[PDB]
Amino acid sequence: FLKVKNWETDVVLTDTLHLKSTLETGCTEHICMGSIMLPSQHTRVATKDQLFPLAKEFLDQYYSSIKRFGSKAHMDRLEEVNKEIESTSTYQLKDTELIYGAKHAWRNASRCVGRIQWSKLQVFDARDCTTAHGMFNYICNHVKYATNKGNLRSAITIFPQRTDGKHDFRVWNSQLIRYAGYKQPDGSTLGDPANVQFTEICIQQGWKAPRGRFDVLPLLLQANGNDPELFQIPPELVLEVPIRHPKFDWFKDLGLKWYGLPAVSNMLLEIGGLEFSACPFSGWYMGTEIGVRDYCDNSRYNILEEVAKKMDLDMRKTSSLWKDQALVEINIAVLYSFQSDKVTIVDHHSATESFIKHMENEYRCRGGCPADWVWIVPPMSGSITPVFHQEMLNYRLTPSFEYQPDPWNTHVWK
Amino acid sequence: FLKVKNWETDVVLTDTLHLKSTLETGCTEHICMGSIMLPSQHTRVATKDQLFPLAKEFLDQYYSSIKRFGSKAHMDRLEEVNKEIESTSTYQLKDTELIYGAKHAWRNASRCVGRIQWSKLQVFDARDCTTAHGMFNYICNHVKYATNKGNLRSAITIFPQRTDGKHDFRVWNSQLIRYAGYKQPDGSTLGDPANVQFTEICIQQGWKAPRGRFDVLPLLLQANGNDPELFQIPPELVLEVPIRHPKFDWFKDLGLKWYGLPAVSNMLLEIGGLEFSACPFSGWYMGTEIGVRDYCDNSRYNILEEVAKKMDLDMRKTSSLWKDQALVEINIAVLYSFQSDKVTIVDHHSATESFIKHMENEYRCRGGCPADWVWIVPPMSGSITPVFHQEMLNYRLTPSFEYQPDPWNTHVWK
Numbered sequence A, B: 001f002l003k004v005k006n007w008e009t010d011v012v013l014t015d016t017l018h019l020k021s022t023l024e025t026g027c028t029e030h031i032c033m034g035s036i037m038l039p040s041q042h043t044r045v046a047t048k049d050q051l052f053p054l055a056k057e058f059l060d061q062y063y064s065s066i067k068r069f070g071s072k073a074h075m076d077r078l079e080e081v082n083k084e085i086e087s088t089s090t091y092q093l094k095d096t097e098l099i100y101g102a103k104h105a106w107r108n109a110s111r112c113v114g115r116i117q118w119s120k121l122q123v124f125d126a127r128d129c130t131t132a133h134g135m136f137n138y139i140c141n142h143v144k145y146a147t148n149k150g151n152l153r154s155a156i157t158i159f160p161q162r163t164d165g166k167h168d169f170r171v172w173n174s175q176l177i178r179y180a181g182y183k184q185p186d187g188s189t190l191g192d193p194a195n196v197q198f199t200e201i202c203i204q205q206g207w208k209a210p211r212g213r214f215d216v217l218p219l220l221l222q223a224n225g226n227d228p229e230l231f232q233i234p235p236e237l238v239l240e241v242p243i244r245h246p247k248f249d250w251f252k253d254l255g256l257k258w259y260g261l262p263a264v265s266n267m268l269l270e271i272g273g274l275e276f277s278a279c280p281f282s283g284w285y286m287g288t289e290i291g292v293r294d295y296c297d298n299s300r301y302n303i304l305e306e307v308a309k310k311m312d313l314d315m316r317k318t319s320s321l322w323k324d325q326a327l328v329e330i331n332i333a334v335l336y337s338f339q340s341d342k343v344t345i346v347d348h349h350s351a352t353e354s355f356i357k358h359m360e361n362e363y364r365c366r367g368g369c370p371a372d373w374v375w376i377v378p379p380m381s382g383s384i385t386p387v388f389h390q391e392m393l394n395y396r397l398t399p400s401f402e403y404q405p406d407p408w409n410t411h412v413w414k
């Protein structure tokens, strides 16, 4: 029955939810791995034995959540999936069970700061899909829907669950919308250094690249374990926001822009023991992910160099904080540009206040809220946001999202 | 034999030191408390039984560190302290053992980012002290020495070790040099809200307060379990740095200043099982502790309000990032002001690079380096510094510094 304090308002909350926790963290009594990026307990193959308690555990919380726990409709659902796990050695989720499982994967994502919106998520059932073209069609309707003309809406599309393991549905993109990265002759990088491998994989499969900076990549969609195929999202569906500053008329000249929709596609959704290897999900951007991480990371776009140049800053001495100075202007510019186009974006102050507010109801109407401090605190201005001063308990509940290996290091190609 | 990666340069280091670890963290396999401020394993009473293995463990690493492990001088030291623990049920450290133990407490402090300097520490042996006046004298020589006319030097003064537990030496100040906090009639706070309780404890013991903002507090020194007594550090020893900005001539008008010497006094130093309840230690400031935390924390000096006012910023809308803007200027000003007075200060970029450099040698010439990410990453501009992208293993080695309760919630007053 542990306690977590906020050393800015002296607020104290009581976490009992951590007792329902199941998966492991990576920490022991004699070591803490809270700062390891991809721990082995966060990454993803299961059999028929363990598959039933996982179903039982899930079904029990789903009926506990509709004030119908243990009743007749529960006990028959229990025996029906029990029976079907005898028969098939797997089972199929109801439409309502999929919506619940998906929404609570988000709820349980301790590194997500946006989770105040977990209840308002739009679940698209793509479990009837059979072909890469079909996947492309479900994904286009996802992007159009979630984008909603800049009035962004939260959504997730769920392709059929893993079974044998070799007939797996996988989006090979890490996000549906990403800018291509190209290496140069001198080794330098054009576009986005992150994707330079993925960009070559797409050109390996015949992508004619318009070798520039902000080139939207094609989708690589793998259907039922078949070799993936290229598909180009209709440009009218990819909404982009050109970045301008509300003081600097030279800020246009920089020529930066960013896509409206953050939409992660390489993750695995885990419900009741069932594994959905493809399940792209989208929301809206917090400003810092673009303005701080995308733009100013060393091995990303890396623009602090030039923003300080046009600002004419003390770029000789480290202790002038010219980097800090150029970084705050870039984020004011991101926020302003997205806002002036009615494209949904949230600032790191408002999102961290909302999270503390979210954390409040989670400890009351639920008894806790798993949170990963290392990831919740924004990557700039840490301590002026209220989450820096809030203690958080991290633990692994299910349903959940997990990392998985990349398909090109596993897919038996042919 | 665990691995920790740097996701900005793809550097990988191998940590074997974590195996020598002894104390516990607070985390389990099913929960991570990496974000709890004062865990129960970090806070501090022991008997005679366990006291010998602690001596044995310590003495063995001390002789292992002088290429004289297991030799004659070792084995007799082993039996000599063994004998003396039979006799007294405690023991006394050699002068060389105290210097080693103290230096490695610093080395092992996973939340310290400055540890590149751990080998260069000046150890003052105050174990002959018997009276509060004597403590005051050792502390003044500490402050004069470590301050060195603004050319700051690292040092620590070690008062006699705990024994019975009721005759304990304790500095009641949290830092030797701190500004007083006073509450107002309207509830508001003048000076430093942190110390408002300690300021009243000093006035409880007869401090005539010059009720202002930056009033250096008196020392409250407790000697051999006796009631503590007030002492006023000679003002000529308290070096202060008036804060001015290298662009804004209105920055003087703010009227801020800060003491040169950070010097923590409320901690407990643990060596070979022996507990030193008073052991003030000083170094030099990283800029952010003043400019970010002292100045801009909500329940500290809280000046973002006024710095944005004189800067004339968009103080209506949160998403203008006026807070981020006023915060970078305050830190450029801190750095500049301290530097223009030849007073040693380090910026959060240089100190975090040095730490990564330090981490490098620690994994080579030692096999590891305990690090607490939550605390190492500076409280501003997190992700432009190289420690944000560095995985770190936190574990508890000894000798170490620990938190302890406050003496006014324990001291049997009379």
Ligand code: HEM
Pocket: A042, A105, A106, A109, A110, A111, A112, A113, A114, A115, A117, A121, A154, A155, A156, A281, A282, A283, A284, A285, A286, A289, A346, A351, A375, A401
């Ligand atoms: C609605 C607005 C949302 C915002 C503002 C938001 C913001 C963020 C941010 C800043 C992160 C940190 C990761 C990083 O820095 O790259 C994150 C992580 C994450 N979010 Fe949210 N997100 C939103 C919606 C969603 C949705 C719709 C889902 C899924 C249904 C989701 C699930 C996750 C997951 C799984 C992670 C990563 C956890 C991990 O790395 O293990 N989020 N989000």
Ligand code: HEM
Pocket: B042, B105, B106, B109, B110, B111, B112, B113, B114, B115, B117, B121, B154, B155, B156, B281, B282, B283, B284, B285, B286, B289, B346, B351, B375, B401
């Ligand atoms: C020489 C320059 C030094 C610098 C720049 C420095 C900087 C820092 C900073 C920024 C912190 C984070 C704590 C906070 O934000 O309040 C810290 C923590 C700490 N430092 Fe260092 N420090 C220095 C010297 C020392 C020395 C001389 C000692 C002791 C011999 C020491 C031991 C510690 C300890 C024990 C902690 C706190 C660990 C905890 O909270 O459990 N440091 N230091």
Ligand SMILES: CCN(CC)CCc1cc(F)c(F)c(OCc2cc(C)cc(N)n2)c1
Pocket: A037, A262, A263, A264, A267, A281, A282, A283, A284, A285, A286, A289
């Ligand atoms: C380990 C490598 N990193 C960087 C490539 C992974 C980053 C990452 C992994 C995930 F699983 C995520 F859900 C994730 O969501 C970012 C995000 C998602 C949404 C819907 C909205 C938003 N505003 N932001 C971001």
Ligand SMILES: CCN(CC)CCc1cc(F)c(F)c(OCc2cc(C)cc(N)n2)c1
Pocket: B037, B262, B263, B264, B267, B281, B282, B283, B284, B285, B286, B289
């Ligand atoms: C839990 C409450 N917090 C804030 C009051 C404790 C802060 C704190 C605790 C410690 F043990 C420390 F050693 C510490 O060192 C700050 C510091 C020390 C030195 C020598 C140099 C420097 N540049 N900085 C700071």
Ligand SMILES: C[C@H](O)[C@H](O)[C@H]1CNc2nc(N)[nH]c(=O)c2N1
Pocket: A035, A036, A037, A374, A375, A376, B007, B388, B389, B390, B391, B392
């Ligand atoms: C080393 C560390 O695990 C890694 O850099 C993490 C730190 N915290 C983060 N937090 C967020 N939100 N996103 C990130 O990519 C990271 N990176």
Ligand SMILES: C[C@H](O)[C@H](O)[C@H]1CNc2nc(N)[nH]c(=O)c2N1
Pocket: A007, A388, A389, A390, A391, A392, B035, B036, B037, B374, B375, B376
């Ligand atoms: C909630 C959290 O434990 C607390 O705010 C910590 C976070 N990290 C920190 N890191 C440093 N260096 N100093 C601090 O006071 C804190 N505060």
Ligand SMILES: [Zn+2]
Pocket: A027, A031, A032, A033, A034, B027, B031, B032, B033, B034
């Ligand atoms: Zn942990």
